[PDB]
Structures are given as C-alpha cells and as structure tokens.
Amino acid sequence: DKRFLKLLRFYILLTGIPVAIGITLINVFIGEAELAEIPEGYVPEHWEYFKHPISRWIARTFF
C-alpha cells in the first residue's frame, strides 16, 4: 500500500511540479492580455480573442 501511494505521488509530481512552475513563470513574466478596441480596418486572428497566454496558445496551435 505504501509503495503504490509513493509511486502515485511521484508520477503526479513528475509533471505537476514543472507545470506549476511553468504556469507560475508564464503568469509572472508574461501575464495576461489587455482588453482593447479593434483598431480600424484590422482583422484579429481567431486566437487573439482570448485572455490567457496558455488559452490562446491552445487556440492557435490545436483548435
């Protein structure tokens, strides 16, 4: 029983710690977009309608 719980928290933390550090480093050093009016005659990319950098990375790359 102990071994499994140890493995469970190792493999969850194996990517959990890097992702939490990565998300924190994105928020601190990149931060969220600013809401803005659409400049005249300008056509935004479909992924330029989202606030968080990870959200608009998902929209740009995958969706």
Binding site: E34, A36, E37, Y49
Partner: protein, 173 residues
Amino acid sequence: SWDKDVYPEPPRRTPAPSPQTSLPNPITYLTKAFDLLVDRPVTLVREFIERQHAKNKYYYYHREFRRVPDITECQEKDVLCMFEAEMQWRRDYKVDQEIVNIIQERLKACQQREGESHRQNCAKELEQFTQVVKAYQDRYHDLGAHYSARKCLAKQKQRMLAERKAAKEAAAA
C-alpha cells in the same frame, strides 16, 4: 477594471471614529500590524509582477458579430438562411441569460449592502429585476430542451394573437 454603470453602487459613508473610552482599541493596532506585515509586502510583490507585465504588453479583443437576417425572413426549409439565423438566435439567447444574471447580481448586492433597511432601499433593484425576468420569460420559457428560433417565433405569434384578440374584445367595451 469594471464599468460602474453596469455594476453601480452608491458612495460609501463611513462614520468618523468618536471614542469615549480610555482603553486602547484592539482593532486599531491590529489594523496597523496588518498594513505592515501583510498589505505592505503583498503590495511590493505585486508591483514587481506589474513591472514584468508592462515590459511585454499584448492585447485581446471582444469579438463583434455582424447582424444577419433572422428566422422571420428565412424561407421555409432554406437551411443556409435558417442556419445563420439560428446561430444568431442562439447567441442572443446566451447573451440574454447573462443580462438576467447581471440584474440578479445587482439585486443580491443591494440586499446585502442595505442590511436591515433592504426592504425599502432596494425597491428600485427589485422593480428592474421583476421586469427583465418578465421579458426573458416571454422569449424563452416553455420552449423545451430542443429549443430553436422557429419555436421561439411560434411562441411569440401565439402571444401576439392572444393580445390582438384581447384588444379587440375590449374595443367594444
């Protein structure tokens, strides 16, 4: 951050301190400990973050949707016109849900803010809430899970017919 017209609130009226005691007030000294131990270092760390954010500013936009002809102008079984009219109605239906949510928030905020004086001081918010619920109910209520623009229109035309029949029978009266 937000728009004070959509989410209005009156101006704060804080009474001035007026002690009539010799004992020190425990809350007063705790508040200065809080402003030193908590609020101060927190404000410092936030400012550092803001400095990093001002170095790299980028923007996102609010998507604008052109108006298209609605269901009423769509010829029967012309799916290309009905499709665009329906996607528009499904957007306006979701937009109207949030409008009711905005009015409900105002009502709830007013009730808490006025405390024991709420039944009289929130009579305007209640009046607004009653109407927008009446407006939303007419458009969308009793449509079912497979609601559509077609069923919304059929509901309105039934209501318009009822009013018209109701109006004439009172003309003689």
